[PDB]
Scaffold this motif. Sequence first.
Motif, PDB file in Angstrom:
ATOM      1  N   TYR A 104      48.585  54.012  38.520  1.00  0.00           N
ATOM      2  CA  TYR A 104      47.530  54.504  39.408  1.00  0.00           C
ATOM      3  C   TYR A 104      46.190  54.169  38.770  1.00  0.00           C
ATOM      4  CZ  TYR A 104      50.811  57.307  42.302  1.00  0.00           C
ATOM      5  OH  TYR A 104      51.810  57.715  43.145  1.00  0.00           O
ATOM      6  N   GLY A 105      45.277  53.603  39.541  1.00  0.00           N
ATOM      7  CA  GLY A 105      43.982  53.233  38.991  1.00  0.00           C
ATOM      8  C   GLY A 105      43.067  54.435  38.953  1.00  0.00           C
ATOM      9  N   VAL A 106      42.416  54.693  37.831  1.00  0.00           N
ATOM     10  CA  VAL A 106      41.506  55.835  37.755  1.00  0.00           C
ATOM     11  C   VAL A 106      40.195  55.484  38.454  1.00  0.00           C
ATOM     12  CG1 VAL A 106      42.205  57.402  35.898  1.00  0.00           C
ATOM     13  CG2 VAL A 106      41.344  55.110  35.299  1.00  0.00           C
ATOM     14  N   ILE A 107      40.009  56.059  39.631  1.00  0.00           N
ATOM     15  CA  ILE A 107      38.800  55.859  40.428  1.00  0.00           C
ATOM     16  C   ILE A 107      37.673  56.622  39.752  1.00  0.00           C
ATOM     17  CG2 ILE A 107      37.655  56.523  42.637  1.00  0.00           C
ATOM     18  CD1 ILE A 107      40.611  56.363  43.850  1.00  0.00           C
ATOM     19  N   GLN A 108      38.004  57.825  39.314  1.00  0.00           N
ATOM     20  CA  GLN A 108      37.044  58.714  38.689  1.00  0.00           C
ATOM     21  C   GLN A 108      37.823  59.537  37.680  1.00  0.00           C
ATOM     22  OE1 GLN A 108      34.460  61.273  41.446  1.00  0.00           O
ATOM     23  NE2 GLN A 108      35.359  62.732  40.041  1.00  0.00           N
ATOM     24  N   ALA A 109      37.500  59.385  36.405  1.00  0.00           N
ATOM     25  CA  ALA A 109      38.163  60.137  35.349  1.00  0.00           C
ATOM     26  C   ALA A 109      37.169  60.579  34.285  1.00  0.00           C
ATOM     27  CB  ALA A 109      39.270  59.297  34.723  1.00  0.00           C
ATOM     28  N   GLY A 110      37.005  61.879  34.142  1.00  0.00           N
ATOM     29  CA  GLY A 110      36.145  62.406  33.092  1.00  0.00           C
ATOM     30  C   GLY A 110      35.862  63.877  33.270  1.00  0.00           C
ATOM     31  N   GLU A 111      35.816  64.294  34.521  1.00  0.00           N
ATOM     32  CA  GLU A 111      35.573  65.680  34.881  1.00  0.00           C
ATOM     33  C   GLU A 111      36.761  66.516  34.408  1.00  0.00           C
ATOM     34  OE1 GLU A 111      35.471  62.995  36.998  1.00  0.00           O
ATOM     35  OE2 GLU A 111      33.299  62.823  36.753  1.00  0.00           O
ATOM     36  N   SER A 112      36.530  67.797  34.169  1.00  0.00           N
ATOM     37  CA  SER A 112      37.576  68.670  33.634  1.00  0.00           C
ATOM     38  C   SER A 112      38.289  69.427  34.738  1.00  0.00           C
ATOM     39  CB  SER A 112      36.961  69.651  32.644  1.00  0.00           C
ATOM     40  OG  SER A 112      36.279  68.934  31.627  1.00  0.00           O
ATOM     41  N   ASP A 113      37.870  69.173  35.963  1.00  0.00           N
ATOM     42  CA  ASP A 113      38.413  69.828  37.146  1.00  0.00           C
ATOM     43  C   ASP A 113      38.893  68.863  38.237  1.00  0.00           C
ATOM     44  OD1 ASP A 113      35.726  70.058  39.342  1.00  0.00           O
ATOM     45  OD2 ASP A 113      35.447  69.362  37.277  1.00  0.00           O
ATOM     46  N   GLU A 114      38.326  67.664  38.323  1.00  0.00           N
ATOM     47  CA  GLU A 114      38.693  66.709  39.379  1.00  0.00           C
ATOM     48  C   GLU A 114      38.982  65.295  38.843  1.00  0.00           C
ATOM     49  OE1 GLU A 114      36.590  66.059  43.673  1.00  0.00           O
ATOM     50  OE2 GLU A 114      35.749  64.861  42.058  1.00  0.00           O
ATOM     51  N   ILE A 115      40.096  64.691  39.253  1.00  0.00           N
ATOM     52  CA  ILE A 115      40.410  63.297  38.869  1.00  0.00           C
ATOM     53  C   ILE A 115      40.930  62.578  40.106  1.00  0.00           C
ATOM     54  CG2 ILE A 115      41.582  61.721  37.194  1.00  0.00           C
ATOM     55  CD1 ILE A 115      42.110  64.211  35.422  1.00  0.00           C
ATOM     56  N   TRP A 116      40.415  61.384  40.365  1.00  0.00           N
ATOM     57  CA  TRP A 116      40.846  60.585  41.513  1.00  0.00           C
ATOM     58  C   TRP A 116      41.676  59.399  41.030  1.00  0.00           C
ATOM     59  CZ3 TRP A 116      39.426  61.656  46.748  1.00  0.00           C
ATOM     60  CH2 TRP A 116      38.460  62.691  46.899  1.00  0.00           C
ATOM     61  N   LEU A 117      42.846  59.233  41.626  1.00  0.00           N
ATOM     62  CA  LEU A 117      43.789  58.172  41.270  1.00  0.00           C
ATOM     63  C   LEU A 117      44.078  57.311  42.498  1.00  0.00           C
ATOM     64  CD1 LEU A 117      44.785  58.410  38.287  1.00  0.00           C
ATOM     65  CD2 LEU A 117      44.462  60.698  39.203  1.00  0.00           C
ATOM     66  N   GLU A 118      43.895  56.007  42.378  1.00  0.00           N
ATOM     67  CA  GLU A 118      44.187  55.065  43.461  1.00  0.00           C
ATOM     68  C   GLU A 118      45.695  54.885  43.529  1.00  0.00           C
ATOM     69  OE1 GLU A 118      43.829  50.326  44.086  1.00  0.00           O
ATOM     70  OE2 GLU A 118      41.901  51.224  43.547  1.00  0.00           O
ATOM     71  N   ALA A 119      46.264  54.972  44.723  1.00  0.00           N
ATOM     72  CA  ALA A 119      47.699  54.797  44.903  1.00  0.00           C
ATOM     73  C   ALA A 119      48.014  53.296  44.712  1.00  0.00           C
ATOM     74  CB  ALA A 119      48.104  55.278  46.316  1.00  0.00           C
ATOM     75  N   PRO A 120      48.811  52.930  43.684  1.00  0.00           N
ATOM     76  CA  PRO A 120      49.010  51.491  43.456  1.00  0.00           C
ATOM     77  C   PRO A 120      49.890  50.822  44.496  1.00  0.00           C
ATOM     78  CG  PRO A 120      50.419  52.735  41.995  1.00  0.00           C
ATOM     79  CD  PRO A 120      49.536  53.738  42.684  1.00  0.00           C
ATOM     80  N   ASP A 121      50.725  51.621  45.140  1.00  0.00           N
ATOM     81  CA  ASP A 121      51.623  51.151  46.185  1.00  0.00           C
ATOM     82  C   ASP A 121      50.837  50.698  47.403  1.00  0.00           C
ATOM     83  OD1 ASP A 121      52.562  53.857  44.836  1.00  0.00           O
ATOM     84  OD2 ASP A 121      54.369  52.645  45.149  1.00  0.00           O
ATOM     85  N   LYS A 122      49.656  51.294  47.568  1.00  0.00           N
ATOM     86  CA  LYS A 122      48.774  51.053  48.722  1.00  0.00           C
ATOM     87  C   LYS A 122      49.567  51.316  49.994  1.00  0.00           C
ATOM     88  CE  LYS A 122      45.949  48.635  45.625  1.00  0.00           C
ATOM     89  NZ  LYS A 122      44.889  47.684  45.191  1.00  0.00           N
ATOM     90  N   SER A 123      50.352  52.369  49.850  1.00  0.00           N
ATOM     91  CA  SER A 123      51.199  52.967  50.867  1.00  0.00           C
ATOM     92  C   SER A 123      50.300  53.719  51.844  1.00  0.00           C
ATOM     93  CB  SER A 123      52.206  53.915  50.201  1.00  0.00           C
ATOM     94  OG  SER A 123      53.186  54.374  51.119  1.00  0.00           O
ATOM     95  N   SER A 124      50.904  54.400  52.808  1.00  0.00           N
ATOM     96  CA  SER A 124      50.168  55.229  53.763  1.00  0.00           C
ATOM     97  C   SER A 124      49.135  56.146  53.080  1.00  0.00           C
ATOM     98  CB  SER A 124      51.158  56.079  54.553  1.00  0.00           C
ATOM     99  OG  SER A 124      52.239  55.277  55.000  1.00  0.00           O
ATOM    100  N   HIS A 125      49.407  56.571  51.847  1.00  0.00           N
ATOM    101  CA  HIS A 125      48.423  57.306  51.044  1.00  0.00           C
ATOM    102  C   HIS A 125      47.619  56.292  50.249  1.00  0.00           C
ATOM    103  CE1 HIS A 125      50.347  61.435  51.243  1.00  0.00           C
ATOM    104  NE2 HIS A 125      49.065  61.714  51.370  1.00  0.00           N
ATOM    105  N   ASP A 126      46.304  56.405  50.313  1.00  0.00           N
ATOM    106  CA  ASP A 126      45.415  55.499  49.594  1.00  0.00           C
ATOM    107  C   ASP A 126      45.106  56.001  48.194  1.00  0.00           C
ATOM    108  OD1 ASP A 126      44.465  55.367  52.681  1.00  0.00           O
ATOM    109  OD2 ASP A 126      43.943  53.488  51.655  1.00  0.00           O
ATOM    110  N   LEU A 127      44.958  57.313  48.057  1.00  0.00           N
ATOM    111  CA  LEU A 127      44.570  57.917  46.780  1.00  0.00           C
ATOM    112  C   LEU A 127      45.135  59.324  46.633  1.00  0.00           C
ATOM    113  CD1 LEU A 127      40.809  58.356  47.702  1.00  0.00           C
ATOM    114  CD2 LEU A 127      41.662  56.033  47.547  1.00  0.00           C
ATOM    115  N   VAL A 128      45.071  59.826  45.408  1.00  0.00           N
ATOM    116  CA  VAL A 128      45.506  61.175  45.059  1.00  0.00           C
ATOM    117  C   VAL A 128      44.348  61.864  44.328  1.00  0.00           C
ATOM    118  CG1 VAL A 128      47.257  62.554  43.792  1.00  0.00           C
ATOM    119  CG2 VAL A 128      47.890  60.310  44.753  1.00  0.00           C
TER     120      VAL A 128
END
Length: 185
Positions: free
Chosen positions: A20-44
């Motif tokens: 999963y590609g880290v779209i945004q990583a550093g905050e202690s409460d929120e992290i965005w992960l790009e879905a590598p499958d690029k399936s119906s879900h785009d991100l987590v």
Amino acid sequence: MFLLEYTYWKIAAHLVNSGYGVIQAGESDEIWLEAPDKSSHDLVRLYKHDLDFRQEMVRDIEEQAERVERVRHQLGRRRMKLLNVFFSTEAPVDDWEEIAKKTFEKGTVSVEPAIVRGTMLRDDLQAVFPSFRTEDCSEEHASFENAQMARERFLSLVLKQEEQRKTEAAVFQNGKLERENLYFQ
């Protein structure tokens, strides 16, 4: 220093180490992960927040969807889908179950709410992330203090992932779970 906070960093680690590609990583409460499958879900979105009422629980999704509308623009997709996982010590005291059973849709955004609650965390976590091993969250290691170390391990892990993805190209294994359940009346 929280029990869920330990799990929050450990999941970030397993996902980025699963490609999963880290779209945004550093905050202690929120992290965005790009879905590598690029399936119906785009991100987590991993979100470390405790929720008292289902009111706040649905309210968060209202904001998440507007945040996602911005991402939809750069993704160019006809619909955008986010998996949003709350990390809470306990579940909201009332009606929260309806919320996990409903897809939040706003305009062209679709959001799949999920919440892992400390009360049943070992089972709950693998229900959302079966890619995560419950053994890695052993009770003797999952502590409020360990959450500090979990962040450090994650920070060294995201850098190690750079080397891991090179060898990953030599794929040799595949698997699936096919866990389906739904509900009906």
